Coordinates of C-alpha atoms and ligand atoms in Angstrom, one line a residue:
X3 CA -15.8 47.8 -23.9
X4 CA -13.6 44.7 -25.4
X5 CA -15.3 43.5 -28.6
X6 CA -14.1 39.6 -28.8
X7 CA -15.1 36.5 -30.2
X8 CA -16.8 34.6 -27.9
X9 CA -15.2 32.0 -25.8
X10 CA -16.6 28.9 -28.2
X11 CA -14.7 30.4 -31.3
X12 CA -11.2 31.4 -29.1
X13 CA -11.3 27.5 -27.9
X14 CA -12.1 26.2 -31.5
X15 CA -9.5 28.2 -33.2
X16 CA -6.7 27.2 -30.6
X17 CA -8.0 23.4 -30.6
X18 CA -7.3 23.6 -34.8
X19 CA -4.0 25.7 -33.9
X20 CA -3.0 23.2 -31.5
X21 CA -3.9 19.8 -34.2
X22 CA -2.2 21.4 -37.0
X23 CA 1.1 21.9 -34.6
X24 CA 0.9 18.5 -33.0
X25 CA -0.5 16.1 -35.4
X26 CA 0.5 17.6 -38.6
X27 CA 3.8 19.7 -38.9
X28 CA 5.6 18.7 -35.5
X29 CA 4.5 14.9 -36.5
X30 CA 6.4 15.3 -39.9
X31 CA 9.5 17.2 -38.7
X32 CA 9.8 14.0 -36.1
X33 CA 9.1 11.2 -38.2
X34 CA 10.2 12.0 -41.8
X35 CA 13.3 14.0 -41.3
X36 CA 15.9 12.6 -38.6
X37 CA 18.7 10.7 -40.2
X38 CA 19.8 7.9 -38.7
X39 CA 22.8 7.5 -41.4
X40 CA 24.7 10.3 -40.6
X41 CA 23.1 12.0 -37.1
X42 CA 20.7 15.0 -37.2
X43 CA 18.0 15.7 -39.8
X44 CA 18.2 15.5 -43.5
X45 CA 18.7 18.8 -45.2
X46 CA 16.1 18.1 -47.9
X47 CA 12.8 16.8 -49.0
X48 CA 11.9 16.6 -52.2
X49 CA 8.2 17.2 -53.1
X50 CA 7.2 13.2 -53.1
X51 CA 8.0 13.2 -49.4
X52 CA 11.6 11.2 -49.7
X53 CA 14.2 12.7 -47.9
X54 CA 17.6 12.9 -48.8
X55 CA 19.7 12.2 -46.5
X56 CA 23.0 12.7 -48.6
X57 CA 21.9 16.5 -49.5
X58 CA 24.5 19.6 -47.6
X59 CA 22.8 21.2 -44.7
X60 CA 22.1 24.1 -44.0
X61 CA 23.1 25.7 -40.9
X62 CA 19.4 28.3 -41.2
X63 CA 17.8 25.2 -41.3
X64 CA 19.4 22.7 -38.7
X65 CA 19.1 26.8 -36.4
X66 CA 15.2 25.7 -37.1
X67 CA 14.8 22.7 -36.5
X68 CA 16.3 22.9 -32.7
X69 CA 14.6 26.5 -32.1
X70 CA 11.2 24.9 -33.3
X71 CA 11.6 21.7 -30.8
X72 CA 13.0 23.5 -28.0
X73 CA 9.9 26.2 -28.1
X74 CA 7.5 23.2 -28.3
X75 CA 9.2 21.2 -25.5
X76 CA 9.1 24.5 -23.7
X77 CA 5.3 25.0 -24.0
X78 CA 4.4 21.4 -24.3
X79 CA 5.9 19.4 -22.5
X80 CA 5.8 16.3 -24.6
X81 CA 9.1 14.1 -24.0
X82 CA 9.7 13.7 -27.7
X83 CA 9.9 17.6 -28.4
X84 CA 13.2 17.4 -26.0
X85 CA 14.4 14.3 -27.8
X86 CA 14.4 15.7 -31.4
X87 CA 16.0 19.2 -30.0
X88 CA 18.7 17.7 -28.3
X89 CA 19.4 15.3 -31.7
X90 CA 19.6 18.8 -33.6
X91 CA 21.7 20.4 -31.1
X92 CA 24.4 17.9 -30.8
X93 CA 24.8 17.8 -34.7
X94 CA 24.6 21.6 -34.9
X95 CA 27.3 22.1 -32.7
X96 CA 29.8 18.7 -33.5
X97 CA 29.5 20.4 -37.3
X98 CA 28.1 23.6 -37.8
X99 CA 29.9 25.3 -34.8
X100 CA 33.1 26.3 -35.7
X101 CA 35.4 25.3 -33.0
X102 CA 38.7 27.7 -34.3
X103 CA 37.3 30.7 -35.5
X104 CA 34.0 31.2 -34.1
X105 CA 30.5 31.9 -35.1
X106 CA 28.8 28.7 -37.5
X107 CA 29.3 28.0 -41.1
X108 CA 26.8 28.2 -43.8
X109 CA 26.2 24.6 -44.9
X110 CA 27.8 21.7 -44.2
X111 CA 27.8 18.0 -46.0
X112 CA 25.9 15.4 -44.7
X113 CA 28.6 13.8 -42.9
X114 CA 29.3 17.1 -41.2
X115 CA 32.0 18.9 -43.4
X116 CA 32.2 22.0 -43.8
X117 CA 31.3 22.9 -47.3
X118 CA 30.7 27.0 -47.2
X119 CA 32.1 28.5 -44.6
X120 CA 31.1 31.6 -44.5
X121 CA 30.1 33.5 -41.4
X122 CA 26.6 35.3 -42.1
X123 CA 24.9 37.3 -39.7
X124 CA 21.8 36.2 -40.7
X125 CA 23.0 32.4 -39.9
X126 CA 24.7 33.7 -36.7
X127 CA 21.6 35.4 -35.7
X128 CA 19.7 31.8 -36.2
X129 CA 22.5 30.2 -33.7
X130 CA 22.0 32.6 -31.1
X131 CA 17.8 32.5 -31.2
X132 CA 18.3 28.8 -31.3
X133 CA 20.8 28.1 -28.7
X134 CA 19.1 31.1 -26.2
X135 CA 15.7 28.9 -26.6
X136 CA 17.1 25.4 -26.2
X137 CA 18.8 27.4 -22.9
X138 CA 15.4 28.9 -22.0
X139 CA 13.9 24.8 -22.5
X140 CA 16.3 23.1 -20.5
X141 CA 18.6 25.6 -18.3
X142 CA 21.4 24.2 -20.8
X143 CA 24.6 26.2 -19.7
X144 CA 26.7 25.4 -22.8
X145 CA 24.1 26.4 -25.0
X146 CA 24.0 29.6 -23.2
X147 CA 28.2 30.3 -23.9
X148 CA 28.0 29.5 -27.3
X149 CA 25.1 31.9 -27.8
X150 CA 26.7 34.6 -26.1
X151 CA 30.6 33.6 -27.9
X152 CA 28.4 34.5 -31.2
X153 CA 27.0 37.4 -29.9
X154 CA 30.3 38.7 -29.1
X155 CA 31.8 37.5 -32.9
X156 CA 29.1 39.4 -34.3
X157 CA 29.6 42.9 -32.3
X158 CA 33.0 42.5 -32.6
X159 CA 33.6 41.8 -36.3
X160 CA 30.6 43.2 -38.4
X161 CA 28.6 46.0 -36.1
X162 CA 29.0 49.0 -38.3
X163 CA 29.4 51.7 -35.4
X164 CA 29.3 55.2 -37.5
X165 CA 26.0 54.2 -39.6
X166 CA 24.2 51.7 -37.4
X167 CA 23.3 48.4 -38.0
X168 CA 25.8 45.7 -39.2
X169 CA 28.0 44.5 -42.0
X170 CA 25.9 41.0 -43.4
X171 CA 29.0 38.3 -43.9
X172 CA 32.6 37.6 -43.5
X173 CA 34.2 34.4 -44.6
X174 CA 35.6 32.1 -42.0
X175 CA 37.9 33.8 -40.3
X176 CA 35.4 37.3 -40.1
X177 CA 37.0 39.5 -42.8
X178 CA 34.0 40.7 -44.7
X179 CA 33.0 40.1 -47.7
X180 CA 31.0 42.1 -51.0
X181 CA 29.0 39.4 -51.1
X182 CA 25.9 39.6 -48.5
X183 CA 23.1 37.9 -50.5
X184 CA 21.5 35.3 -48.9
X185 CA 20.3 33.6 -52.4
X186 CA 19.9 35.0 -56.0
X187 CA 16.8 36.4 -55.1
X188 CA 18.5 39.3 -53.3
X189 CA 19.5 42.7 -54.1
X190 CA 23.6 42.6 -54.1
X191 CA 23.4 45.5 -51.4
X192 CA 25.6 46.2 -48.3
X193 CA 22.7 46.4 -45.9
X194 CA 19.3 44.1 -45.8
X195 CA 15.8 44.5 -43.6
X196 CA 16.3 40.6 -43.4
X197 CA 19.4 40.5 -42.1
X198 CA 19.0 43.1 -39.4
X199 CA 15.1 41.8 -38.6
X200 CA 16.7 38.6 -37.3
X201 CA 19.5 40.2 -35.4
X202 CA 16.6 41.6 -33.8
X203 CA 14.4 39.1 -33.3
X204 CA 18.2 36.6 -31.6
X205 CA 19.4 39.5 -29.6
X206 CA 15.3 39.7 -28.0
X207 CA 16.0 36.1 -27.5
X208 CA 19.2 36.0 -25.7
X209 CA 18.3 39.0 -24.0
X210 CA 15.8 37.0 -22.4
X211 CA 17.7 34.3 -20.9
X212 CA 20.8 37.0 -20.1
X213 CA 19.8 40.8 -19.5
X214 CA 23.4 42.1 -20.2
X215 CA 23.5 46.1 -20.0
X216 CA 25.6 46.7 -23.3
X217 CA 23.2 43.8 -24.9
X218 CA 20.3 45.9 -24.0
X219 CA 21.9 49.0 -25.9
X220 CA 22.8 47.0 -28.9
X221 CA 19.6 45.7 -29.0
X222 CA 17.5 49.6 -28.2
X223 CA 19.8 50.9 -31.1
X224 CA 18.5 47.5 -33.2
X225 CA 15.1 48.8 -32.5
X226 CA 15.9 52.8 -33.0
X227 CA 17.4 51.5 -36.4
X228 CA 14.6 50.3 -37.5
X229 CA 12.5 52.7 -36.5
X230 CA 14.3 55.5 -38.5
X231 CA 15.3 54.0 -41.7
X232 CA 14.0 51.3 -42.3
X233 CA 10.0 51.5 -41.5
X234 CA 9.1 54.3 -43.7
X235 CA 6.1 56.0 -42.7
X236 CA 4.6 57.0 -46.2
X237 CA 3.9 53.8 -47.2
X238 CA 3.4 51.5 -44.1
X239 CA 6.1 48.8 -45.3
X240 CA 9.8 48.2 -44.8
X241 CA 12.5 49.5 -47.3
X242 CA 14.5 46.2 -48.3
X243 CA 17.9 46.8 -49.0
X244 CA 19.7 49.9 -48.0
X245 CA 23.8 51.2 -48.4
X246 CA 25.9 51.7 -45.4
X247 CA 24.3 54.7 -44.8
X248 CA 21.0 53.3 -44.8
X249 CA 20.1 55.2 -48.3
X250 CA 17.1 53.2 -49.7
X251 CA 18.3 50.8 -52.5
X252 CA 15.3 48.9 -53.2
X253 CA 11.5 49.8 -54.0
X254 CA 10.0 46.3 -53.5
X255 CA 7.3 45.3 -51.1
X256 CA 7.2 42.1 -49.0
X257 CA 3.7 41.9 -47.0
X258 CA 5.3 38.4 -45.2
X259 CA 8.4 40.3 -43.6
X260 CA 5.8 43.4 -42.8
X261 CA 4.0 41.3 -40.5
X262 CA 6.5 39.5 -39.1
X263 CA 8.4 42.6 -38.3
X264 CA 5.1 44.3 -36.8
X265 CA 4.8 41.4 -34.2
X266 CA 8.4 41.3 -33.5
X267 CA 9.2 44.7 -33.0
X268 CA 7.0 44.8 -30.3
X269 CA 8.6 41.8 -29.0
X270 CA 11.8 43.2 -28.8
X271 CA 10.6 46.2 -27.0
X272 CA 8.9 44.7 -24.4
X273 CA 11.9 42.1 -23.9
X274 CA 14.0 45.4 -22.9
X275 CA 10.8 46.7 -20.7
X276 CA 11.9 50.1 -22.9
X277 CA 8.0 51.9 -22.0
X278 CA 9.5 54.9 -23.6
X279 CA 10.5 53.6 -26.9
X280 CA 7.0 51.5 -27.0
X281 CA 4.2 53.9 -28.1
X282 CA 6.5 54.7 -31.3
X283 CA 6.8 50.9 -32.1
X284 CA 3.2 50.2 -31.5
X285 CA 2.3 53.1 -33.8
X286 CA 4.9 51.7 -36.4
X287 CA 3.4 48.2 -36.1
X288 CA 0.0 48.8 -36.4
X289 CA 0.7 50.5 -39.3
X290 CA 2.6 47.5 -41.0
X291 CA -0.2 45.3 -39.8
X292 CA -2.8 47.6 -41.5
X293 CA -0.9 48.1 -45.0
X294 CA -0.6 44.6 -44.8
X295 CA -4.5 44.1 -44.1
X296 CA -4.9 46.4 -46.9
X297 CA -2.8 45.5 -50.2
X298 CA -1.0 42.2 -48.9
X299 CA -4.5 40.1 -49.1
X300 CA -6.3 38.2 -51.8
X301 CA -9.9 38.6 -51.4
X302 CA -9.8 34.6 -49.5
X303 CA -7.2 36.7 -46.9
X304 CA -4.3 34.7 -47.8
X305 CA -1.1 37.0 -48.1
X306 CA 0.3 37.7 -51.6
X307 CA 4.2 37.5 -51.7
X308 CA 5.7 40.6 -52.8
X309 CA 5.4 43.5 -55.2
X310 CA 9.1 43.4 -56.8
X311 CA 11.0 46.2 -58.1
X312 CA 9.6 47.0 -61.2
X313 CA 5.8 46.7 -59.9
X314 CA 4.9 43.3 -60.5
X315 CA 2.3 41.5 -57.9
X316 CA 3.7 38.0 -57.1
X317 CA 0.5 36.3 -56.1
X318 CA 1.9 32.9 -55.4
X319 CA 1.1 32.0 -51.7
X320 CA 4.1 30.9 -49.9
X321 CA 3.9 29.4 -46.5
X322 CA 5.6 31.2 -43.9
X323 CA 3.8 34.7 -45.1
X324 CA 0.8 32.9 -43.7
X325 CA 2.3 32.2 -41.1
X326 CA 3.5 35.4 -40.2
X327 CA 0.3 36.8 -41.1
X328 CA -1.5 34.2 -38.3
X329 CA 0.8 35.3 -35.5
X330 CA 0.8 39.1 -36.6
X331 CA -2.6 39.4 -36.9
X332 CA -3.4 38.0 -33.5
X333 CA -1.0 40.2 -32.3
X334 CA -2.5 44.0 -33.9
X335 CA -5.6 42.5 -32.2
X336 CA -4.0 42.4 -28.8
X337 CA -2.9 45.5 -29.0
X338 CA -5.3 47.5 -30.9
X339 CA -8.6 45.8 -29.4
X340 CA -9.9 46.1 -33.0
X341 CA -11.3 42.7 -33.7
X342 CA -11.1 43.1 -37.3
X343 CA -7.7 42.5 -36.8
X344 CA -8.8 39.1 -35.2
X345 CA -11.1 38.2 -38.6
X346 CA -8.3 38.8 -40.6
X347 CA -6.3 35.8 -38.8
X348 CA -9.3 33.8 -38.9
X349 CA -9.2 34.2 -42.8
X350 CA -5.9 33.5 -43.3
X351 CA -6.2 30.4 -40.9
X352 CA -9.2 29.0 -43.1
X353 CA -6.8 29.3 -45.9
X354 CA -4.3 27.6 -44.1
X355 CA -6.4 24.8 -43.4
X356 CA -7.8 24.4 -46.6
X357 CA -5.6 25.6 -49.3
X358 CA -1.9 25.6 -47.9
X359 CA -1.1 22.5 -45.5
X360 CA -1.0 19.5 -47.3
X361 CA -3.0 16.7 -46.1
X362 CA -2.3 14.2 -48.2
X363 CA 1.8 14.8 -47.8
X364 CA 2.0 16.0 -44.7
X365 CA 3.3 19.5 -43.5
X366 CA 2.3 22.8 -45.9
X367 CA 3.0 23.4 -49.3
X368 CA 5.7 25.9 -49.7
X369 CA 4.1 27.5 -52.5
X370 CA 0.2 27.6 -53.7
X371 CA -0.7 29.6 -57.0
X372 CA -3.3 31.9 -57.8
X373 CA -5.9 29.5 -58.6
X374 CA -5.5 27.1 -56.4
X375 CA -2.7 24.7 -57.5
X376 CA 0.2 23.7 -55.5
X377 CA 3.4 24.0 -56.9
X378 CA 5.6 20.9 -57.0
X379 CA 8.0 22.4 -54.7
X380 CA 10.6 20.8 -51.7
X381 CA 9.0 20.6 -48.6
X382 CA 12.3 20.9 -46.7
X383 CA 15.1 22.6 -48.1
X384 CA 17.7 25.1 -47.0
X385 CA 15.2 28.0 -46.3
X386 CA 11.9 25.8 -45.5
X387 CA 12.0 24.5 -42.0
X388 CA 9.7 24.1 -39.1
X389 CA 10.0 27.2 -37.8
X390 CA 7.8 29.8 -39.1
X391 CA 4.9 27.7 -39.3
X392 CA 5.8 25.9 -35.9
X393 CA 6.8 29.3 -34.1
X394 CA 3.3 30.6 -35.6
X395 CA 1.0 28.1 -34.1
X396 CA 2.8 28.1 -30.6
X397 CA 2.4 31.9 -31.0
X398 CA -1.2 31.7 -31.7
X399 CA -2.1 29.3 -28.9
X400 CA -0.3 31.4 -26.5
X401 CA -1.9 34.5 -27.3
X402 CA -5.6 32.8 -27.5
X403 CA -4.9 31.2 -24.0
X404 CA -4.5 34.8 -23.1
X405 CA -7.5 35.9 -24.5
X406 CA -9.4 33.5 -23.4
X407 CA -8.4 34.3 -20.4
X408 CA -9.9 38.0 -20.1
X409 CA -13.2 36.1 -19.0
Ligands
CL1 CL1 11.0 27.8 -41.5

C-alpha cells in the first residue's frame, strides 16, 4: 500500500542528482579551487570565478572540502575523488592540526600559518566528521587517531557535565572563552543549536567507523539533549541559542537547520541502533519536516532563510537550505511513506535546477533573491563549501537507489 513515483521518474530524478554532482559542483571543486602555489585549495572565490589563492583558510571549509571528496570517492569510485581528498587532507593536517595543543585552529594563511587559533567546537566537530569519512574511504589509520585525539579534546575541555551539552570555544590552549559566535550573524550566547547539531552529526560519524561504549553515551545524551530542549514541540522548529542551562535565548526561525536536523537526527539514532529512543526522534522529525513544508516554502518550493528575531521573513534563497531541504525531504518520505513529502523534493530540486545552480559560472549561487536575481556573492568562502550541496546529492542518490529498489 506504498504510494511512489514510478520507476521512470525515481531514475530521472537520480540521473539529474547524479549530473549536477558529477559534472557540475564536484567538476568545479576539482578544477577551479586546488592551489598549486601553496598546496591544498584556495580559501576563496570571488563571484567572477577567480580564485584567490593568497586569501586565509578556513579550517570549516578545508573540514569540507576533504569530507565532500572522501564521501564521493566512497560511493563513486572515481580515482580523482581520492586524489583531491588526500590533497585536502595532507594540507589540513601539515597546517590546520595543531601538533602541541590539540584539536585544529580556526583559519590559517595561505602558506599554512596559523592566523586564529582558536579551538571551536563547531570547527572540531568538522575535523572529526571529516577525518572519520576519509577513514571510512580508505581504512586510513592516522586519520582515525586524530579523529578520535579530537574527540577526546572536546569531552575533555568543553562537555558541560551538570547542564548537558558543551561549552562552544576555547582559545588554543582550551581555556574557554565568552566569545562563541561563529560570525556576526550570531546571537552572543553560551549555547548554540549549530554548534551542538554538528557535534551530533561528527560523533554519528566517528561512531561509525569506532563504536566506543562511552562514545555511544555521549552521543544518546547528544540526541536526548536535543530532544528536550532544543526541539520544541509547540512550534515544530529548533530554539537557536540557549544559556547554560538551556533557557531559550532566541525566538528566530531557521527552516534550513530544521531540515537538516530532521534528517540527521534520525541518522544519529540509527548509527547507535538506539530502537528505544527512535519513535520519539521520528515523531520530532517529522514534525520539523512538516513545519518546514508548511511556512519554510515559497509557493515555487524553494526554502526561505529565516524568520529573525523581531519577525522579519528573510526570503533570500541561500543554497545549502535547498540543499538540506533535498536530502530532508527524501528522507520524511522514507519514513513516513507520504509521498507528498517526495513532491516537495521534487519542487525544491526544479528550483535547484533552474533558479539556484549557476550554469553559466559553475557550482550554485549562494544566494538568489525574491524575484529571481542572484546576488553577486563568493562562491567559495569560509562558510560556502562543497559540502552541503555535495553531501545532498550523494544523499539523494543513495536513498532513490533504495527506492528504486522496493520493485
Ligand atoms: Cl558547504
Amino acid at each position: 500500500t506504498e504510494t511512489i513515483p514510478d520507476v521512470r521518474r525515481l531514475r530521472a530524478l537520480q540521473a539529474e542528482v547524479h549530473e549536477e554532482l558529477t559534472e557540475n559542483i564536484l567538476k568545479f571543486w576539482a578544477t577551479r579551487t586546488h592551489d598549486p602555489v601553496h598546496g591544498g585549495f584556495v580559501g576563496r572565490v570571488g563571484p567572477d570565478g577567480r580564485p584567490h589563492p593568497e586569501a586565509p583558510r578556513g579550517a570549516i571549509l578545508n573540514a569540507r572540502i576533504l569530507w565532500t571528496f572522501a564521501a564521493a570517492y566512497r560511493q563513486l569510485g572515481t580515482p580523482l575523488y581520492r586524489e583531491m581528498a588526500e590533497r585536502a587532507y595532507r594540507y589540513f593536517v601539515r597546517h590546520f592540526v595543531d601538533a602541541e595543543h590539540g584539536g585544529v585552529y580556526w583559519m590559517v594563511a595561505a602558506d599554512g600559518r596559523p592566523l586564529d587559533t582558536r579551538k571551536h567546537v563547531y570547527a572540531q566537530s568538522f575535523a572529526i566528521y571529516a577525518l572519520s569519512e576519509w577513514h571510512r574511504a580508505t581504512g586510513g589509520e592516522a586519520a582515525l587517531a586524530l579523529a578520535r585525539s579530537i574527540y577526546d579534546l572536546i569531552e575533555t575541555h568543553c562537555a558541560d557535565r551538570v547542564h548537558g551539552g558543551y561549552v562552544e570555544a576555547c582559545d588554543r590552549a582550551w581555556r574557554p572563552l565568552e566569545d562563541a559566535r561563529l560570525s556576526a550573524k550570531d546571537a552572543p550566547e553560551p549555547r548554540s543549536m549549530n554548534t551542538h547539531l554538528h557535534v551530533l552529526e561528527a560523533y554519528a560519524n566517528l561512531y561509525r567507523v569506532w563504536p566506543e561504549t562511552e562514545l555511544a553515551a555521549r552521543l544518546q545524551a547528544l540526541i536526548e539533549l536535543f530532544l528536550r530542549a532544543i526541539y520544541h514541540p509547540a512550534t515544530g522548529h529548533l530554539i537557536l541559542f540557549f544559556d547554560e542551562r538551556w533557557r531559550p535565548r532566541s525566538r528566530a526561525v531557521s527552516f534550513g537547520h530544521d531540515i537538516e536536523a530532521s534528517w540527521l537526527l534520525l541518522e544519529a539514532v540509527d548509527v547507535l541502533g538506539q530502537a528505544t529512543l527512535r519513535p520519539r526522534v521520528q515523531q520530532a522529525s517529522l514534525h520539523l519536516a512538516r513545519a518546514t513544508l508548511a511556512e519554510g516554502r515559497a509557493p515555487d518550493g524553494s526554502l526561505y532563510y529565516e524568520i529573525g528575531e523581531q519577525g522579519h521573513l528573510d526570503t533570500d534563497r541561500h543554497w545549502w537550505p535547498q540543499a538540506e531541504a533535498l536530502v530532508g525531504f527524501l528522507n520524511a518520505y522514507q519514513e513516513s511513506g507520504e509521498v507528498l513529502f517526495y513532491e516537495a523534493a521534487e519542487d525544491v530540486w526544479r528550483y535547484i535546477r533552474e533558479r539556484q545552480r549557476d550554469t553559466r559560472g559553475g557550482e550554485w549561487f549562494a544566494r538568489v533573491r525574491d524575484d529571481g536575481a542572484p546576488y553577486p556573492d563568493d562562491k567559495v568562502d569560509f562558510w560556502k563549501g562543497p559540502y552541503h550541496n555535495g553531501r545532498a546529492c550523494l544523499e539523494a542518490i543513495q536513498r532513490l537507489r533504495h527506492l528504486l529498489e522496493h520493485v
